[PDB]
Short mmCIF file of C-alpha atoms and ligand atoms in Angstrom, two decimals:
data_model
loop_
_atom_site.label_atom_id
_atom_site.label_comp_id
_atom_site.label_asym_id
_atom_site.label_seq_id
_atom_site.Cartn_x
_atom_site.Cartn_y
_atom_site.Cartn_z
CA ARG A 28 -10.94 -7.67 30.02
CA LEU A 29 -9.32 -5.59 28.37
CA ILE A 30 -6.84 -7.05 25.53
CA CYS A 31 -7.45 -4.15 22.17
CA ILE A 32 -7.39 -0.66 22.58
CA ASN A 33 -11.63 -0.61 21.24
CA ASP A 34 -12.57 -2.81 24.64
CA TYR A 35 -10.93 0.50 26.17
CA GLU A 36 -13.43 2.67 24.35
CA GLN A 37 -16.31 0.45 25.27
CA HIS A 38 -15.29 0.24 28.54
CA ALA A 39 -14.63 4.04 29.12
CA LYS A 40 -18.84 4.90 27.76
CA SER A 41 -19.75 2.21 30.63
CA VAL A 42 -18.07 4.52 33.75
CA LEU A 43 -17.55 7.98 32.87
CA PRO A 44 -20.66 10.54 32.39
CA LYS A 45 -22.37 10.83 28.87
CA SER A 46 -21.41 13.93 28.12
CA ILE A 47 -17.48 14.03 29.06
CA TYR A 48 -17.39 10.47 27.30
CA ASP A 49 -19.53 12.90 24.37
CA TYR A 50 -16.63 16.21 24.35
CA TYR A 51 -14.17 13.23 23.34
CA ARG A 52 -16.24 10.69 21.17
CA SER A 53 -17.32 13.39 19.02
CA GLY A 54 -16.39 14.44 15.61
CA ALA A 55 -17.30 17.34 13.26
CA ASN A 56 -21.36 17.34 11.71
CA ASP A 57 -22.41 14.67 10.84
CA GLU A 58 -19.89 12.83 11.29
CA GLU A 59 -18.26 11.44 7.96
CA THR A 60 -15.04 12.18 8.33
CA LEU A 61 -14.64 10.38 12.58
CA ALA A 62 -15.78 7.29 10.63
CA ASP A 63 -13.37 7.33 7.49
CA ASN A 64 -11.17 7.79 9.63
CA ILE A 65 -10.89 4.06 10.31
CA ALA A 66 -11.68 2.67 7.31
CA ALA A 67 -9.50 3.56 5.66
CA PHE A 68 -7.20 1.78 7.21
CA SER A 69 -8.92 -1.08 6.20
CA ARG A 70 -8.58 -0.52 3.15
CA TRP A 71 -4.66 0.04 2.90
CA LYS A 72 -4.36 -4.00 2.13
CA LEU A 73 -0.86 -5.82 3.17
CA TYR A 74 1.71 -7.55 1.50
CA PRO A 75 3.87 -9.65 4.24
CA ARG A 76 7.08 -10.80 3.20
CA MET A 77 8.11 -14.13 4.35
CA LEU A 78 11.08 -15.97 5.82
CA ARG A 79 12.21 -12.91 6.86
CA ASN A 80 13.82 -13.62 10.29
CA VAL A 81 12.42 -11.33 12.65
CA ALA A 82 13.49 -12.92 15.54
CA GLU A 83 14.94 -9.80 16.82
CA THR A 84 12.40 -7.23 16.17
CA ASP A 85 14.03 -3.56 16.98
CA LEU A 86 11.05 -1.08 17.05
CA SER A 87 13.05 2.54 18.23
CA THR A 88 13.13 5.37 15.91
CA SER A 89 14.03 8.45 16.01
CA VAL A 90 10.70 11.94 16.49
CA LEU A 91 12.80 15.48 15.12
CA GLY A 92 16.37 13.91 16.15
CA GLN A 93 15.58 12.41 19.66
CA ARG A 94 15.01 8.72 20.22
CA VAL A 95 12.43 6.99 21.02
CA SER A 96 11.05 3.21 22.22
CA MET A 97 8.52 3.39 19.04
CA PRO A 98 7.07 5.13 16.34
CA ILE A 99 4.13 5.69 18.36
CA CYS A 100 3.84 9.11 20.85
CA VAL A 101 1.23 10.50 22.57
CA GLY A 102 -1.13 13.44 20.97
CA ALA A 103 -2.42 16.61 22.02
CA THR A 104 -5.92 15.93 23.70
CA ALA A 105 -7.78 18.80 26.19
CA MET A 106 -9.06 18.66 29.15
CA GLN A 107 -7.37 15.09 30.43
CA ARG A 108 -8.21 15.29 33.91
CA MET A 109 -12.13 15.09 33.35
CA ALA A 110 -10.83 11.94 32.40
CA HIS A 111 -9.23 10.33 35.63
CA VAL A 112 -8.98 12.88 38.38
CA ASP A 113 -4.03 12.22 37.46
CA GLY A 114 -5.44 13.26 33.68
CA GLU A 115 -1.81 15.54 32.63
CA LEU A 116 0.40 13.45 35.02
CA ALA A 117 -1.06 10.05 34.63
CA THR A 118 -0.12 10.37 31.24
CA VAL A 119 3.13 12.04 31.38
CA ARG A 120 4.70 9.56 33.92
CA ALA A 121 3.22 6.84 32.01
CA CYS A 122 5.16 7.85 28.28
CA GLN A 123 7.44 8.09 30.73
CA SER A 124 7.55 4.72 31.56
CA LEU A 125 6.74 3.29 27.92
CA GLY A 126 9.76 5.21 26.48
CA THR A 127 7.76 7.67 24.44
CA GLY A 128 6.86 11.02 23.82
CA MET A 129 4.06 13.10 25.34
CA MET A 130 2.78 16.37 23.35
CA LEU A 131 1.02 18.97 25.79
CA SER A 132 -2.11 20.10 24.75
CA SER A 133 -2.77 23.84 25.12
CA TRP A 134 -5.49 23.47 26.59
CA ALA A 135 -4.79 21.24 29.58
CA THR A 136 -6.61 20.36 32.84
CA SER A 137 -2.58 20.48 34.12
CA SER A 138 0.49 23.55 34.08
CA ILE A 139 3.24 23.03 31.42
CA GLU A 140 5.23 23.22 35.11
CA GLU A 141 3.27 20.44 36.70
CA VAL A 142 3.57 18.06 33.80
CA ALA A 143 7.09 18.46 33.45
CA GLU A 144 8.34 18.50 36.57
CA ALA A 145 5.44 14.55 37.26
CA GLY A 146 7.64 13.67 34.30
CA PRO A 147 11.01 15.45 33.79
CA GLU A 148 12.96 12.28 31.91
CA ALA A 149 9.85 11.64 29.05
CA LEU A 150 10.34 13.42 26.60
CA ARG A 151 7.91 16.34 25.82
CA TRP A 152 6.26 18.71 22.66
CA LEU A 153 3.70 21.61 23.20
CA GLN A 154 1.01 21.76 21.21
CA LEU A 155 0.20 25.43 20.39
CA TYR A 156 -2.61 27.66 19.70
CA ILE A 157 -2.23 31.91 18.60
CA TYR A 158 -4.08 33.23 20.65
CA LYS A 159 -5.49 36.78 20.10
CA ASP A 160 -3.11 38.43 22.74
CA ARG A 161 0.85 37.30 21.87
CA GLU A 162 1.75 38.10 25.08
CA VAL A 163 0.16 34.24 26.14
CA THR A 164 1.39 33.14 23.70
CA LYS A 165 4.99 33.95 23.84
CA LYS A 166 5.13 33.31 27.85
CA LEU A 167 4.15 29.76 26.85
CA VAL A 168 6.79 28.70 24.41
CA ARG A 169 8.94 30.41 26.47
CA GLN A 170 7.99 27.99 29.23
CA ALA A 171 8.61 25.24 26.97
CA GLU A 172 11.59 26.17 26.06
CA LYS A 173 12.60 26.54 30.17
CA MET A 174 10.83 23.65 30.92
CA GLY A 175 12.25 21.31 28.53
CA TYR A 176 10.50 20.70 26.13
CA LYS A 177 11.68 19.83 22.49
CA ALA A 178 9.49 21.21 19.90
CA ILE A 179 5.98 22.93 19.23
CA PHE A 180 3.38 21.70 17.49
CA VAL A 181 1.51 25.01 15.94
CA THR A 182 -2.57 23.44 14.72
CA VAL A 183 -3.60 25.42 12.19
CA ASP A 184 -5.98 24.16 11.43
CA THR A 185 -8.13 26.12 14.53
CA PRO A 186 -9.12 29.57 12.48
CA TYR A 187 -12.67 28.58 14.95
CA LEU A 188 -13.82 25.41 16.51
CA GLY A 189 -15.83 22.68 14.53
CA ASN A 190 -19.15 21.87 15.15
CA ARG A 191 -19.47 19.27 17.44
CA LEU A 192 -23.24 18.80 17.37
CA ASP A 193 -23.47 16.91 20.99
CA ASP A 194 -21.30 19.92 21.97
CA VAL A 195 -23.97 21.91 21.48
CA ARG A 196 -26.92 19.80 22.40
CA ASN A 197 -25.57 19.03 25.89
CA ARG A 198 -23.97 22.50 26.61
CA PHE A 199 -20.34 21.18 26.62
CA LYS A 200 -17.63 23.27 29.47
CA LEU A 201 -15.66 21.55 32.63
CA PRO A 202 -16.85 20.13 35.97
CA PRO A 203 -17.38 22.81 38.14
CA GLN A 204 -13.57 21.81 40.62
CA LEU A 205 -11.29 21.86 37.05
CA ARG A 206 -9.10 24.73 34.55
CA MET A 207 -7.36 25.43 31.84
CA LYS A 208 -3.96 25.25 34.62
CA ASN A 209 -1.84 27.27 31.94
CA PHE A 210 -4.42 30.82 31.85
CA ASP A 211 -24.01 26.29 22.95
CA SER A 212 -20.94 24.78 22.74
CA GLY A 213 -18.74 26.52 25.74
CA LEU A 214 -15.83 25.69 23.90
CA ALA A 215 -16.77 27.24 20.74
CA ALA A 216 -17.23 29.67 22.72
CA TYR A 217 -14.29 29.82 24.60
CA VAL A 218 -12.30 29.45 21.27
CA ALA A 219 -14.38 32.33 19.54
CA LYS A 220 -13.60 34.46 22.41
CA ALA A 221 -9.17 33.26 22.55
CA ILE A 222 -8.08 32.14 19.40
CA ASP A 223 -7.26 34.25 16.70
CA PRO A 224 -8.83 33.81 12.96
CA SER A 225 -6.92 35.88 11.41
CA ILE A 226 -3.08 33.58 11.90
CA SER A 227 -1.07 33.69 8.26
CA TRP A 228 1.81 32.56 7.21
CA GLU A 229 3.28 35.67 8.65
CA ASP A 230 2.23 35.15 12.07
CA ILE A 231 4.05 31.30 10.65
CA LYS A 232 6.66 33.76 10.20
CA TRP A 233 6.72 35.68 13.23
CA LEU A 234 7.14 32.37 15.44
CA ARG A 235 9.71 30.66 13.08
CA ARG A 236 11.00 34.19 14.56
CA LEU A 237 10.56 33.63 18.28
CA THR A 238 12.10 30.66 18.92
CA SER A 239 15.10 27.83 18.43
CA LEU A 240 13.03 24.61 18.93
CA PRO A 241 11.65 22.61 15.89
CA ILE A 242 8.31 23.10 15.48
CA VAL A 243 5.79 21.27 13.47
CA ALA A 244 2.82 22.48 11.47
CA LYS A 245 -0.46 20.67 12.90
CA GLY A 246 -3.73 20.17 10.62
CA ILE A 247 -1.68 20.66 7.16
CA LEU A 248 -3.71 18.60 5.34
CA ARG A 249 -2.52 19.80 1.24
CA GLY A 250 0.26 19.83 -0.22
CA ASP A 251 0.77 22.96 -1.55
CA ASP A 252 0.35 23.36 2.22
CA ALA A 253 3.19 21.49 2.97
CA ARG A 254 5.60 23.29 0.38
CA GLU A 255 4.62 26.38 2.30
CA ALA A 256 5.88 24.63 6.39
CA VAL A 257 9.16 23.25 4.80
CA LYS A 258 9.80 27.31 2.71
CA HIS A 259 8.52 28.90 6.17
CA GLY A 260 11.85 26.88 7.73
CA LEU A 261 9.26 24.80 9.92
CA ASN A 262 11.39 20.90 10.72
CA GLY A 263 8.44 18.66 9.55
CA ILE A 264 4.12 17.82 9.19
CA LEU A 265 2.13 16.34 11.69
CA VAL A 266 -0.60 15.92 8.57
CA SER A 267 -4.01 15.39 11.04
CA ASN A 268 -7.93 16.25 9.91
CA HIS A 269 -7.58 17.23 14.21
CA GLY A 270 -9.64 13.87 14.73
CA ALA A 271 -12.24 14.77 12.74
CA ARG A 272 -13.16 17.25 14.68
CA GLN A 273 -12.64 20.72 12.33
CA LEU A 274 -14.12 20.48 8.46
CA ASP A 275 -16.12 17.47 7.99
CA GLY A 276 -16.03 15.60 4.70
CA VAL A 277 -11.93 16.32 4.74
CA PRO A 278 -10.31 13.08 3.15
CA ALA A 279 -9.02 10.21 6.31
CA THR A 280 -5.53 10.89 6.56
CA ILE A 281 -4.03 8.05 5.67
CA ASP A 282 -6.07 8.93 2.08
CA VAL A 283 -3.81 12.22 1.74
CA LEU A 284 -0.09 11.01 3.46
CA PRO A 285 0.99 9.38 0.46
CA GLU A 286 0.47 13.08 -1.49
CA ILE A 287 2.28 14.47 1.79
CA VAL A 288 5.29 12.69 1.86
CA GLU A 289 5.75 13.43 -2.47
CA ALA A 290 5.25 17.52 -1.92
CA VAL A 291 8.21 17.11 1.14
CA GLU A 292 11.18 15.82 -0.62
CA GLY A 293 12.27 14.31 1.62
CA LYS A 294 13.74 17.47 4.01
CA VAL A 295 11.81 17.28 6.64
CA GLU A 296 10.15 13.95 8.96
CA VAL A 297 5.68 13.80 8.28
CA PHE A 298 3.41 12.56 11.28
CA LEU A 299 0.30 10.96 10.86
CA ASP A 300 -2.81 11.07 12.88
CA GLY A 301 -6.60 10.11 12.50
CA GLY A 302 -7.36 6.53 13.00
CA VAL A 303 -4.37 4.84 14.72
CA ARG A 304 -6.12 1.97 16.68
CA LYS A 305 -3.81 -1.07 15.64
CA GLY A 306 -0.25 -1.97 15.25
CA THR A 307 -1.24 -3.03 11.40
CA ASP A 308 -2.12 1.07 11.52
CA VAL A 309 1.49 2.30 12.82
CA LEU A 310 2.94 -0.34 10.54
CA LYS A 311 0.96 1.44 7.25
CA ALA A 312 1.30 4.35 8.28
CA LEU A 313 5.42 3.75 8.06
CA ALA A 314 5.32 2.10 4.74
CA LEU A 315 3.70 5.47 3.23
CA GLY A 316 6.32 7.27 4.32
CA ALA A 317 5.65 8.40 7.93
CA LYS A 318 8.46 8.44 10.57
CA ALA A 319 5.28 7.51 13.62
CA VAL A 320 1.83 8.21 14.54
CA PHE A 321 0.30 9.56 17.17
CA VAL A 322 -3.01 8.55 19.28
CA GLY A 323 -5.99 10.58 20.83
CA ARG A 324 -8.31 9.16 21.65
CA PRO A 325 -6.93 5.93 22.91
CA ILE A 326 -5.22 7.17 25.38
CA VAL A 327 -8.53 9.07 26.57
CA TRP A 328 -9.94 5.93 27.49
CA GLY A 329 -6.23 4.40 29.39
CA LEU A 330 -6.57 7.71 31.71
CA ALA A 331 -11.19 6.44 32.53
CA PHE A 332 -9.95 3.12 32.85
CA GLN A 333 -6.98 3.20 35.27
CA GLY A 334 -5.17 6.94 35.19
CA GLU A 335 -1.87 6.75 34.45
CA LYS A 336 -1.98 2.01 34.68
CA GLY A 337 -4.08 2.60 32.03
CA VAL A 338 -2.75 4.56 29.63
CA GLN A 339 0.66 2.07 29.84
CA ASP A 340 -1.65 -0.60 29.18
CA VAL A 341 -2.76 0.88 25.58
CA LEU A 342 0.54 1.93 24.54
CA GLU A 343 1.19 -1.79 26.06
CA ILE A 344 -1.35 -2.85 23.65
CA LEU A 345 0.09 -0.96 20.68
CA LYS A 346 3.65 -1.22 21.01
CA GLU A 347 3.01 -4.88 21.42
CA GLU A 348 0.58 -5.64 18.22
CA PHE A 349 2.98 -2.90 15.86
CA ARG A 350 6.08 -6.09 16.56
CA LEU A 351 3.88 -8.69 15.76
CA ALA A 352 2.64 -6.99 12.88
CA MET A 353 6.27 -5.84 11.98
CA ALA A 354 7.46 -9.72 12.64
CA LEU A 355 4.35 -11.59 9.95
CA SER A 356 5.06 -8.59 7.46
CA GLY A 357 9.37 -9.72 7.78
CA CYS A 358 10.46 -5.94 9.77
CA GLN A 359 13.30 -6.84 11.58
CA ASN A 360 13.34 -2.98 12.46
CA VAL A 361 11.63 0.36 10.94
CA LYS A 362 14.49 1.92 7.98
CA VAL A 363 13.42 -1.62 6.00
CA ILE A 364 9.48 -0.92 6.20
CA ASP A 365 8.89 0.07 3.14
CA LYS A 366 6.47 0.45 0.00
CA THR A 367 5.40 -2.12 -0.83
CA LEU A 368 4.51 -3.99 1.75
CA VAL A 369 1.04 -1.96 1.22
CA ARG A 370 -1.70 -0.96 -1.91
CA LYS A 371 -5.26 0.63 -2.28
C1 LIG B 13 -10.91 15.38 23.01
C2 LIG B 13 -10.15 15.43 22.16
C3 LIG B 13 -9.72 16.80 22.73
C4 LIG B 13 -8.37 17.34 21.89
C5 LIG B 13 -7.91 16.50 20.28
C6 LIG B 13 -8.61 15.34 20.11
C7 LIG B 13 -9.87 15.40 20.80
C8 LIG B 13 -10.64 13.95 20.56
N1 LIG B 13 -7.25 17.97 19.34
C9 LIG B 13 -6.92 17.00 18.36
C10 LIG B 13 -5.90 16.02 18.04
O1 LIG B 13 -4.45 16.19 18.44
C11 LIG B 13 -5.25 14.23 17.44
O2 LIG B 13 -5.22 15.55 16.11
C12 LIG B 13 -6.52 13.47 17.57
O3 LIG B 13 -7.51 12.70 18.99
C13 LIG B 13 -6.54 11.86 16.21
O4 LIG B 13 -7.15 11.33 16.29
P1 LIG B 13 -7.45 9.92 17.18
O5 LIG B 13 -8.25 10.47 18.57
O6 LIG B 13 -6.08 9.25 17.46
O7 LIG B 13 -8.20 9.52 16.26
C14 LIG B 13 -6.42 18.52 19.86
N2 LIG B 13 -5.34 19.40 19.23
C15 LIG B 13 -5.06 20.22 19.72
O8 LIG B 13 -3.81 20.56 19.31
N3 LIG B 13 -5.37 20.69 20.98
C16 LIG B 13 -6.08 20.60 21.91
O9 LIG B 13 -6.27 21.31 22.37
C17 LIG B 13 -7.13 19.18 21.26
N4 LIG B 13 -7.28 18.47 22.10
#
């Protein structure tokens, strides 16, 4: 049956209710960037080296000083219990099995503590939204610290929610039994009520003082903003267009990655998300200077198939595709994945 990530999406469409599948699938507005996040990867071509000896391929690397089994991590996707009863608990259990990290959404259908308890040995980070209520925001950070999370990914591209047309048509909301467990389109209205449109670099200063945990700015698309993040003492940049769900018509993340890598001058790690579906996508992102990539939608499709097992299957497929791509490219380990491997 399911042998690549595209197969998992197709299966998910057949088993999920339309409103739930559309919530997960959709981009903003006409979905121009959604298509481009995938198409852009295909424009970057590979220039493999032969006869390098790839008998022993080592996929391991590090994210903010913590070892991972591969440069492929789970990105924050809200409300995972819509896809499978076990939701974020299934996800964290799979990450623990694989030896990779899970970024937990602030809008999760499972708590910061429920997830630490299900995956005590897993590498775990918290994705933070800055709520109008700074006390709520502090509590989330403090819980992350107490429960053994290793970094804060602060999302900086969402002063308001993007306009996803299917969610408006469907009047999207949670199924009746579910809740965000740490507290038109229903989600757009929620954001308007809860999330602060005023946040500025001064609020990053506040956050930097609040915690000693590593902080990564998630959603940066400009080199000038990346340099400002470095100036504020942040510890990484996640080059992201929010899975094409915020401003439509921004570039693909693979296309802006080189500008951002250049701008930070090696001072902090740079990551990527948006459109990663294949092992060659991962290879391309590393050749252009990313330390690791995050996957969003593929994880939700794993859940929709078979919960924990379906997430593990998706991560295993990406791991094996990546291993093969490295080997066929002449790369024994991630340290030798260089810029001459790709051209646009
Ligand atoms: C259904 C769904 C739900 C969320 C997201 C995305 C999607 C598709 N994303 C953005 C996410 O972290 C990531 O940037 C993208 O999913 C990456 O793109 P791909 O889905 O892998 O193409 C997201 N980001 C975030 O900071 N907080 C959140 O709660 C969510 N929730």
